[PDB]
CSV table of C-alpha atoms and ligand atoms in Angstrom, one decimal:
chain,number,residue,atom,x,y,z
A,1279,UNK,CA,172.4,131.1,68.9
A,1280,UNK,CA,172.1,128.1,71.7
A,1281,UNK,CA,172.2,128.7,75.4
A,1282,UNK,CA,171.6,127.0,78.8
A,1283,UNK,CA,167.9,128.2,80.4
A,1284,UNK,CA,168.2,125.9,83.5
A,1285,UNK,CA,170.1,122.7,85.2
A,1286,UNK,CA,167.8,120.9,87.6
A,1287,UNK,CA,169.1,117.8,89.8
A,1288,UNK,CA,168.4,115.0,89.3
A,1289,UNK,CA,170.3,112.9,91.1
A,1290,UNK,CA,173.6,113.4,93.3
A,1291,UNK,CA,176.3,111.0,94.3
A,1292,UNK,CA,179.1,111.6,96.7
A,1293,UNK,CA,181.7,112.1,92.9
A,1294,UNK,CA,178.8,112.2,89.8
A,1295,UNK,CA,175.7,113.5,89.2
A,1296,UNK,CA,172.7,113.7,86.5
A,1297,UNK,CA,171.2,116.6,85.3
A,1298,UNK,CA,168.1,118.2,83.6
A,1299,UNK,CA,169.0,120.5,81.4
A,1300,UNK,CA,167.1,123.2,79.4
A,1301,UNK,CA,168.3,124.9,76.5
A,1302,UNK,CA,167.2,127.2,73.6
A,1303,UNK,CA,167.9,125.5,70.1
A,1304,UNK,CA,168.9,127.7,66.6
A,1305,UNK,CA,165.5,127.0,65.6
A,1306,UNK,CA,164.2,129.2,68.7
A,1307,UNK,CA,162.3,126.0,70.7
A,1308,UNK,CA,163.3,125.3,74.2
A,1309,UNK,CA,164.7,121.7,74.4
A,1310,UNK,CA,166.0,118.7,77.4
A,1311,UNK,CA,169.3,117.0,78.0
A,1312,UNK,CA,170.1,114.7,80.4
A,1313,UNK,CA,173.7,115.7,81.2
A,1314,UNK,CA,176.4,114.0,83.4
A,1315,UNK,CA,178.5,116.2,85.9
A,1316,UNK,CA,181.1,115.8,88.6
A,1317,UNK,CA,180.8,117.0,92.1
A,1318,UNK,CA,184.3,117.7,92.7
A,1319,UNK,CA,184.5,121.0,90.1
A,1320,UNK,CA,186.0,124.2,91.7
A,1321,UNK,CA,187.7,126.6,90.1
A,1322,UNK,CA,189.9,124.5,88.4
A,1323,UNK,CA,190.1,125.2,85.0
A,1324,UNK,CA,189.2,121.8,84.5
A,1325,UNK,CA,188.1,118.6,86.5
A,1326,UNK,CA,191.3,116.7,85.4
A,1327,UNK,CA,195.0,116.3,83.7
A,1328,UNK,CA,196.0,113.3,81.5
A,1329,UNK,CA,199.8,113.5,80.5
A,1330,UNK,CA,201.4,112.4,77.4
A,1331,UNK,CA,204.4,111.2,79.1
A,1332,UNK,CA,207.7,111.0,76.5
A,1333,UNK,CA,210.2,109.1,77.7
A,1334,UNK,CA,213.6,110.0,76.6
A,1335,UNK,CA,216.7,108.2,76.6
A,1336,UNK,CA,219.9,108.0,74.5
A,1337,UNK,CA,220.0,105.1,72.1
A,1338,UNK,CA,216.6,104.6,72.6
A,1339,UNK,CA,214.0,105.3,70.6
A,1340,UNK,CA,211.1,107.2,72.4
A,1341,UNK,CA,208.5,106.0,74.6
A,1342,UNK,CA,204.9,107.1,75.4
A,1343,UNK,CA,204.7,106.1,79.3
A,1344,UNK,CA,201.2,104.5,79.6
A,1345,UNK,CA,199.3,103.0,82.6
A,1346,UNK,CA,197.3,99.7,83.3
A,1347,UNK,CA,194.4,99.5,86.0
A,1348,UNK,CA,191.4,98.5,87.1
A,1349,UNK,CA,188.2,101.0,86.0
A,1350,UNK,CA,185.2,99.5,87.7
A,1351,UNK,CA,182.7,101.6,85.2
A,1352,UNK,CA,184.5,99.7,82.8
A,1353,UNK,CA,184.5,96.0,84.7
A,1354,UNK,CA,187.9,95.6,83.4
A,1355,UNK,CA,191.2,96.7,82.8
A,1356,UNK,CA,192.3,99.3,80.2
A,1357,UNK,CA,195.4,101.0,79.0
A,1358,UNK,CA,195.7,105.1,79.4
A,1359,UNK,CA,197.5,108.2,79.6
A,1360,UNK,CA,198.4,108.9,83.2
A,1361,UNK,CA,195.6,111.3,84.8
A,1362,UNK,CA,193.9,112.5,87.4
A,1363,UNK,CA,191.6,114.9,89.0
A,1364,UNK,CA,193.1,118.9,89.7
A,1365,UNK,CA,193.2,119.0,93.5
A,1366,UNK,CA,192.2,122.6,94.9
A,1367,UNK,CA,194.5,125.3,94.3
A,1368,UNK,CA,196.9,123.1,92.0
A,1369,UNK,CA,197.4,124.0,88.6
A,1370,UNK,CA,196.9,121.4,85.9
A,1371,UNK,CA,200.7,121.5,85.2
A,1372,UNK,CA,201.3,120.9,88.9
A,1373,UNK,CA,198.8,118.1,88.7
A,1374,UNK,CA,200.2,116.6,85.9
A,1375,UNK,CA,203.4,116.3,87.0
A,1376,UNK,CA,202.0,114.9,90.2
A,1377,UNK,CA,199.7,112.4,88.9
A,1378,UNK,CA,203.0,111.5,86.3
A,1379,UNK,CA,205.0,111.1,89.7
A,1380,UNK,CA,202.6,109.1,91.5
A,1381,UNK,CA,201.2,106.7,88.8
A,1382,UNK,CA,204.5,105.9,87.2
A,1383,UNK,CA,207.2,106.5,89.6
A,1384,UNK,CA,208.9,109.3,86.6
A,1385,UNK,CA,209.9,112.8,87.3
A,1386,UNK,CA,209.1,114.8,84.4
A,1387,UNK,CA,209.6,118.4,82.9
A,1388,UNK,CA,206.6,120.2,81.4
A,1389,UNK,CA,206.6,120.4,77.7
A,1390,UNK,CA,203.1,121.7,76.4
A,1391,UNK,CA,199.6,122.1,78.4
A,1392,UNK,CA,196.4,122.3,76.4
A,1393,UNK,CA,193.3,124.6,77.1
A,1394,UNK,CA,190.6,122.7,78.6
A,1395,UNK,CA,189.2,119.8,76.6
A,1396,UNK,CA,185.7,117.9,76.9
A,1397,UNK,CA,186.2,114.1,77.5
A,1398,UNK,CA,182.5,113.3,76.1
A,1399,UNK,CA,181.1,116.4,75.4
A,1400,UNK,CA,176.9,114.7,74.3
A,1401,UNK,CA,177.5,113.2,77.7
A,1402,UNK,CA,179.1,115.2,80.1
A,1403,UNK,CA,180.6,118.6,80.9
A,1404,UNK,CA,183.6,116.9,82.1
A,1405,UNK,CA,187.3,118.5,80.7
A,1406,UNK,CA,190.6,117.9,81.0
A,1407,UNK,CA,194.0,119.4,80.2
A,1408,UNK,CA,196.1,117.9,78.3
A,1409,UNK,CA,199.5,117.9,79.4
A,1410,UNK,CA,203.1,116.6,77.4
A,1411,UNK,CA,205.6,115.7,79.7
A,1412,UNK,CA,209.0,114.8,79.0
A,1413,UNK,CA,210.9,112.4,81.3
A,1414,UNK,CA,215.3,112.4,80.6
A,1415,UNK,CA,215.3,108.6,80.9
A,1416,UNK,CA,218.8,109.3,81.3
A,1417,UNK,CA,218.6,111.5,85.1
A,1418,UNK,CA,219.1,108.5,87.8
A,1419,UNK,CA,215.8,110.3,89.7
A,1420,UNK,CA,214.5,108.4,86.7
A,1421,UNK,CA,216.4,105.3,87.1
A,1422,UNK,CA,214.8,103.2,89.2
A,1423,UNK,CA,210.7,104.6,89.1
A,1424,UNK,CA,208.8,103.5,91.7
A,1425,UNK,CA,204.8,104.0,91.5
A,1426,UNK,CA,203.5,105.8,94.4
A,1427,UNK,CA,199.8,104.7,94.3
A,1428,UNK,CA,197.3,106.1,97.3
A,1429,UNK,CA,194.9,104.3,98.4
A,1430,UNK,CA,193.1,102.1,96.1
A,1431,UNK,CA,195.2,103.1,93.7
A,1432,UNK,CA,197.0,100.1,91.7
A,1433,UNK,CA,198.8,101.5,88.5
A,1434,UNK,CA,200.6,98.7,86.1
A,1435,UNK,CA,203.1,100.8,83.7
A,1436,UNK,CA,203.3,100.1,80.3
A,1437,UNK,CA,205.8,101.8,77.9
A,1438,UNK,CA,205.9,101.7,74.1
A,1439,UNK,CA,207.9,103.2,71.3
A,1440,UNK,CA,206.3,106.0,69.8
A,1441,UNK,CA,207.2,104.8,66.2
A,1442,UNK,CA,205.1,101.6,66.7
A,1443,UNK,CA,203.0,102.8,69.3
A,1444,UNK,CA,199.4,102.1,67.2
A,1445,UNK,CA,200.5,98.6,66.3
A,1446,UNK,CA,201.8,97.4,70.0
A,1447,UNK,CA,198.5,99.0,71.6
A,1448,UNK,CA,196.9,96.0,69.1
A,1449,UNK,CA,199.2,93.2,70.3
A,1450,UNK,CA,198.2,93.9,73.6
A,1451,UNK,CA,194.3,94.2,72.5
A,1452,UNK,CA,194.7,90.8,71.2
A,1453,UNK,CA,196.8,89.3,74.2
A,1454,UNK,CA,194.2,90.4,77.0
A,1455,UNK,CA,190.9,91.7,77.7
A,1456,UNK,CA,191.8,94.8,78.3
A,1457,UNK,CA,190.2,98.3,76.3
A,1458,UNK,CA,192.3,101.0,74.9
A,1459,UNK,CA,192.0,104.9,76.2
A,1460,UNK,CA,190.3,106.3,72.9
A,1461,UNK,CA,192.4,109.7,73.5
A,1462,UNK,CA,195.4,107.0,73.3
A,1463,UNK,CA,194.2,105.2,70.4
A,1464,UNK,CA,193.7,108.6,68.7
A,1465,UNK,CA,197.2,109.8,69.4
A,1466,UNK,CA,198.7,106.2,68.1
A,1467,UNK,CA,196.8,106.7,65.1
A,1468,UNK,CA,197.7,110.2,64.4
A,1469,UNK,CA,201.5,109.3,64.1
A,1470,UNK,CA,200.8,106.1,61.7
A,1471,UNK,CA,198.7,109.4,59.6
A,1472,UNK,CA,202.1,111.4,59.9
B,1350,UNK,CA,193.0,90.8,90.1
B,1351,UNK,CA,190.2,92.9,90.7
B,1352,UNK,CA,186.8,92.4,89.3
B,1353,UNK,CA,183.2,93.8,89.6
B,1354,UNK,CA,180.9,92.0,92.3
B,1355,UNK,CA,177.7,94.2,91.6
B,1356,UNK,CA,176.2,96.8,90.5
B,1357,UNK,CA,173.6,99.0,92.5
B,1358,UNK,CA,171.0,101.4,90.3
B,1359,UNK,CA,171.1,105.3,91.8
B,1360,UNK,CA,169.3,106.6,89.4
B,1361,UNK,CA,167.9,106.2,85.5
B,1362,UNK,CA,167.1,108.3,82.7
B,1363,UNK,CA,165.5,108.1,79.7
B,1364,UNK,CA,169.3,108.5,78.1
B,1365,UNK,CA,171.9,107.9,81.5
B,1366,UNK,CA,172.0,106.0,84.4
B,1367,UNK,CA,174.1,106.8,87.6
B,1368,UNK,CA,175.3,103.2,89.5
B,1369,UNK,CA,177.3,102.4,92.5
B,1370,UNK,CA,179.5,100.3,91.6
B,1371,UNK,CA,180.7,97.5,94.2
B,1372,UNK,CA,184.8,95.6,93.2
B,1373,UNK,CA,187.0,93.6,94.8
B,1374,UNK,CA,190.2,95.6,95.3
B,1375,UNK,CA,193.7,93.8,94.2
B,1376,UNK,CA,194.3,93.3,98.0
B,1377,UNK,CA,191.1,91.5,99.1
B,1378,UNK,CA,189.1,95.0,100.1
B,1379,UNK,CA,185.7,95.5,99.2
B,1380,UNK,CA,185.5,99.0,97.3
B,1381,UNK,CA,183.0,101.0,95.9
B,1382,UNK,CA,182.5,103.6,92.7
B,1383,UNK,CA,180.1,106.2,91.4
B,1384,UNK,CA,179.7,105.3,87.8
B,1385,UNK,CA,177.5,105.9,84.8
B,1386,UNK,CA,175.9,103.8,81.9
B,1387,UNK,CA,174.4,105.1,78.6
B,1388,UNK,CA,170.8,103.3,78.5
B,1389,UNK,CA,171.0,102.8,74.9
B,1390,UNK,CA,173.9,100.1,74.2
B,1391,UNK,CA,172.7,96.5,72.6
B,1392,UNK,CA,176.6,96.5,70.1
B,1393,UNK,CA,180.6,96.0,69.5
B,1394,UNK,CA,180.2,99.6,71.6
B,1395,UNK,CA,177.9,103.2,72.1
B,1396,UNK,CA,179.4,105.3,69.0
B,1397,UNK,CA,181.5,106.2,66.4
B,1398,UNK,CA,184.1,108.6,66.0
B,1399,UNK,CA,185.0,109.3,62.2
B,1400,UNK,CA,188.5,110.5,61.4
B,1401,UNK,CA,188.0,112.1,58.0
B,1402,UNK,CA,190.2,112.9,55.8
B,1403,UNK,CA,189.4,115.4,53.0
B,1404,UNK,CA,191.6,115.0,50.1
B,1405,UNK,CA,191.6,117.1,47.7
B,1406,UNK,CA,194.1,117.6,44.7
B,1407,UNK,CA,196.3,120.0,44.5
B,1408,UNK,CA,194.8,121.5,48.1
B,1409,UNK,CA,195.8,120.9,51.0
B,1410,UNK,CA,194.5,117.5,53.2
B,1411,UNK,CA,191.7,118.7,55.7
B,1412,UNK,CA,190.6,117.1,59.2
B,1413,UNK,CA,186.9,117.5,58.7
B,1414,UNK,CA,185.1,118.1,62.1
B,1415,UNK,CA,182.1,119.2,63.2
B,1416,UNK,CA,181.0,122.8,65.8
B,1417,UNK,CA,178.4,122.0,67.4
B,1418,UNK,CA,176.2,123.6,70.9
B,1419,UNK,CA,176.5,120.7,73.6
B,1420,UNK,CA,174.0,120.8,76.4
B,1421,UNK,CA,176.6,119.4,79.2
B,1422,UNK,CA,179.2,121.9,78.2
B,1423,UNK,CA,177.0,124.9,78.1
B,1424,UNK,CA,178.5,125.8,74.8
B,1425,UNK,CA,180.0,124.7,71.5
B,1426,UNK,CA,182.8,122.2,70.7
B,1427,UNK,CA,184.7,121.6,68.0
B,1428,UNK,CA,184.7,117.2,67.4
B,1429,UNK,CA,184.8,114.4,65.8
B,1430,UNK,CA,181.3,113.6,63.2
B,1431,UNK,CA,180.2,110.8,65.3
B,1432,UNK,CA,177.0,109.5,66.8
B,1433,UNK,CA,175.4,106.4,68.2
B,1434,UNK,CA,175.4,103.3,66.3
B,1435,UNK,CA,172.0,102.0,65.5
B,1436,UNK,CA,170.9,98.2,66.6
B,1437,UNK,CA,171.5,96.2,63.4
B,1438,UNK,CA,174.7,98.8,61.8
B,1439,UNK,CA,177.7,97.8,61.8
B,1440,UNK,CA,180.5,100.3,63.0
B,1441,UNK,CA,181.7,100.7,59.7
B,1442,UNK,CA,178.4,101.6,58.1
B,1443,UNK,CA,177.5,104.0,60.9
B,1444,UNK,CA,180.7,106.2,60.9
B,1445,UNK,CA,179.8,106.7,57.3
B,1446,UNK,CA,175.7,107.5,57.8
B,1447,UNK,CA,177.4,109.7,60.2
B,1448,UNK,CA,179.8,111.1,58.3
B,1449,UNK,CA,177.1,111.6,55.3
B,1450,UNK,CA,174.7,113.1,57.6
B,1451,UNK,CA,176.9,115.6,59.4
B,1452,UNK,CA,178.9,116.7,56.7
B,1453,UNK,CA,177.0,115.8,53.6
B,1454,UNK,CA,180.4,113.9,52.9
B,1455,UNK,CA,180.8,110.4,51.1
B,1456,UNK,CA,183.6,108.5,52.3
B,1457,UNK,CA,185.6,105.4,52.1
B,1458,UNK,CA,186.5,103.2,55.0
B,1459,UNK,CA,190.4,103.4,55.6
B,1460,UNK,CA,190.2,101.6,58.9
B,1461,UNK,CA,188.2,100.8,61.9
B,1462,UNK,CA,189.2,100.7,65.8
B,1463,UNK,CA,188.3,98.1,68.2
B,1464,UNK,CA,185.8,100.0,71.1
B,1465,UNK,CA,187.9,102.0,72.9
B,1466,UNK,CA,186.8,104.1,76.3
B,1467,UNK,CA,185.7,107.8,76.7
B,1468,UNK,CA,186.0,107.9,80.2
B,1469,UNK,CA,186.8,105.0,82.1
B,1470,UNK,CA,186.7,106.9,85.5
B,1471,UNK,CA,183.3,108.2,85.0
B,1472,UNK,CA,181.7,105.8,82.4
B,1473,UNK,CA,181.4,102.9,80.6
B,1474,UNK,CA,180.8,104.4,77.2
B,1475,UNK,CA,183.0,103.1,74.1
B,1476,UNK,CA,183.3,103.9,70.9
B,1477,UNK,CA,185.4,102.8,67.4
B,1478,UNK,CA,187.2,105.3,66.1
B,1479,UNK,CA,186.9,105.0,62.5
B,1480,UNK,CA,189.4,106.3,60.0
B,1481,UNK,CA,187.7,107.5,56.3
B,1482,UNK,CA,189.2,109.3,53.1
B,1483,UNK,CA,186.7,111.6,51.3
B,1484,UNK,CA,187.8,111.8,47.6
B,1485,UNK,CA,187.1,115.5,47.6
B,1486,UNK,CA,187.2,115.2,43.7
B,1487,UNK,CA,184.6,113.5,43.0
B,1488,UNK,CA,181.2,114.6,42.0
B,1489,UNK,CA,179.5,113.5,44.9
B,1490,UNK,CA,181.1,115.6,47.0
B,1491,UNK,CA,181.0,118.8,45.2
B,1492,UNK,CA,178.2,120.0,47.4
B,1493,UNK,CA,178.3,117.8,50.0
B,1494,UNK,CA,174.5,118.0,51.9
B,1495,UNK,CA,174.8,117.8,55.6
B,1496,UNK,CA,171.3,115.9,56.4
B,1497,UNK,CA,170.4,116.3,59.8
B,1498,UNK,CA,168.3,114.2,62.4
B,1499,UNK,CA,165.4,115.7,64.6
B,1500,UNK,CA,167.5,118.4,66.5
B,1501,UNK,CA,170.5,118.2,65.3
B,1502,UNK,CA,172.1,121.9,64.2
B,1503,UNK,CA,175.7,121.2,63.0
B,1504,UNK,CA,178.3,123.3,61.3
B,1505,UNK,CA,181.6,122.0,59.7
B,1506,UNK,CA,185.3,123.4,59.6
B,1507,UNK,CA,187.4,121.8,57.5
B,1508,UNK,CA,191.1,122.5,58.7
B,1509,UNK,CA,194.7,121.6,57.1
B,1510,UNK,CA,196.0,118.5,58.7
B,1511,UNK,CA,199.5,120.0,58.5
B,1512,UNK,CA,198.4,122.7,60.6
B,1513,UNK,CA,196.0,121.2,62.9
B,1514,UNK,CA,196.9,122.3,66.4
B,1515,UNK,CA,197.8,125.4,65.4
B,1516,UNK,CA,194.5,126.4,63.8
B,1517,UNK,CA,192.7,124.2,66.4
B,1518,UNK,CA,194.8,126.9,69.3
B,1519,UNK,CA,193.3,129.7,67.1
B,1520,UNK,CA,189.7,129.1,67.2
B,1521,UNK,CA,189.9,128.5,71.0
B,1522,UNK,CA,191.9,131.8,71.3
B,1523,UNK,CA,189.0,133.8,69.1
B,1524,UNK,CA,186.0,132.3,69.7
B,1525,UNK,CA,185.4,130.7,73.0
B,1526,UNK,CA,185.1,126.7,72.0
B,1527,UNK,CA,186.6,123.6,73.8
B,1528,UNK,CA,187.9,121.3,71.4
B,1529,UNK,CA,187.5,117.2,72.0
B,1530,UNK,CA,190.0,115.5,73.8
B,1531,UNK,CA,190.4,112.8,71.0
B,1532,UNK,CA,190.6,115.8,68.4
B,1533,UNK,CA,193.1,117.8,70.8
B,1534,UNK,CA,194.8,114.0,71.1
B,1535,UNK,CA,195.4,113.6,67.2
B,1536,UNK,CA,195.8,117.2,66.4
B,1537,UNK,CA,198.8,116.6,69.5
B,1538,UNK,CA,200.1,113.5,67.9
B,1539,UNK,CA,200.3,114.8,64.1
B,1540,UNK,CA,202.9,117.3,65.4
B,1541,UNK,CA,205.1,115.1,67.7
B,1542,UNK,CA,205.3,112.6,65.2
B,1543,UNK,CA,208.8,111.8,64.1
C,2770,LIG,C1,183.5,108.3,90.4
C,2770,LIG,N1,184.3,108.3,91.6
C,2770,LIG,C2,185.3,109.2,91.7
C,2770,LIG,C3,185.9,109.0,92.9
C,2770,LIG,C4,187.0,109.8,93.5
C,2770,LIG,N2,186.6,110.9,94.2
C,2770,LIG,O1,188.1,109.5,93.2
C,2770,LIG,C5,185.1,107.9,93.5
C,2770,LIG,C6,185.2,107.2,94.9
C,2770,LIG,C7,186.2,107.9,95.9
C,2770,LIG,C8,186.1,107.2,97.2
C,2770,LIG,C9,186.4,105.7,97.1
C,2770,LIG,N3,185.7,105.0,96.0
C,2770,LIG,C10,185.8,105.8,94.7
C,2770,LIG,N4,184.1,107.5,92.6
C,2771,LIG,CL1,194.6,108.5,56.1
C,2772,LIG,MG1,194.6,108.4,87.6
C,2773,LIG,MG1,196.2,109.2,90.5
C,2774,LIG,MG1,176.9,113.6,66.4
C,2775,LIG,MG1,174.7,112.2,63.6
């Protein structure tokens, strides 16, 4: 029933911009929305990855592999998946395990990539995949994991047990200012549901 | 470390606003970002996300989310019932007007996030994810009556929480949808748990 009838600029950035846009609504009356879009888009399937990283290790219970930085639309700090933008050509399972590499230091093994997902869908048309990465805790590639941050880059990782992932995430909320991913805080709370 | 040392305006909306963003790197370097605001925060954060949890005896427990057409996307999503949190509401009280509205469901708070981010690389936006149990039994929610706002054309699908990625997977395959990365993040979770 709805559809797009035009996107007019309103504004461009160097990485963001804001858009008009016009659309039919079920009723049959043309409508606005101002809409958010990157300017890096492609072909990529997607703008980004964000890995669920699960660290595995014998005698060990399970780890998700988080990160820790700075987000200045934030003004603070605040806890994540790993993730990054798709570079040209890459595919997001490429990315993912590149991004995984870079932020955390760990060289993982695909597990599972999702279709294309909307970060904040009333907002903007940005998507990501999805992708779970294991890591074998116990190869000594993973021994000694070094981040490998580019340029104004600075990654902090942070690695919790899965099977008290939601409650640790809230010992570090109330440690710190700091803000939790809400695709994190949506995974922790999922396995308290299960 | 690093911290935010202004902010410069690009461009405002009635609903977003695009900023340059000036920080102080961990290293001493003055840096700059493209981020955006939402114009309409007071507020403990923008929105609310409502997990809720159909329960119905002897039935199968549902995930009950919402399909809506999303201007930025250019298409429909399957999400989360959520919306803005009015000046005055508390989270709580707005994940169930949101609830009531977009479903027509009555629910009972189970639990209640602190504001966690959407897209810390892009925006500032935050919301509470807010976990509710809809007694599926009871009278009141029989024939529950989805009342929308002014614009505002939703449709719900109630799926098995047992099978949530699954079926999530299936409507993607059939239908052309993008699912919510929170959704896709919880629907992900519910299977790795354990
Ligand atoms: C919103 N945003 C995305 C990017 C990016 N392309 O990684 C940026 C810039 C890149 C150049 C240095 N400062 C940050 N801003
Ligand atoms: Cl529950
Ligand atoms: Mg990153
Ligand atoms: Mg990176
Ligand atoms: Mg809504
Ligand atoms: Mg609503």
């Amino acid at each position: 029933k709805q559809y797009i009838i035009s996107e007019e600029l309103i504004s461009e950035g160097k990485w963001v911009k804001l858009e008009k846009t016009t659309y039919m609504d079920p009723t049959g009356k043309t409508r606005t929305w101002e809409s958010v879009k990157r300017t890096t888009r492609k072909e990529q399937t997607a703008d980004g990855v964000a890995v669920i990283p699960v660290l595995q290790r014998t005698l060990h219970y399970e780890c998700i592999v988080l990160v820790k930085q700075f987000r200045p639309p934030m003004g603070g700090y605040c806890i994540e998946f790993p993730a990054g933008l798709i570079d040209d050509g890459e595919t997001p399972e490429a990315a993912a395990l590149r991004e995984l590499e870079e932020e955390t230091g760990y060289k993982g093994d695909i597990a599972e990539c999702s279709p294309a997902v909307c970060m904040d869908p009333g907002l903007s048309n940005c998507t990501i995949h999805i992708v779970t990465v294991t890591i074998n805790g116990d190869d000594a590639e993973n021994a000694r994991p070094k981040p490998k941050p580019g340029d104004g880059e600075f990654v902090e990782v942070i690695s919790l047990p899965k099977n008290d992932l939601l409650q640790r995430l809230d010992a570090l909320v109330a440690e710190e200012h700091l803000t939790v991913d809400a695709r994190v805080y949506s995974y922790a709370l999922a396995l308290k549901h299960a």
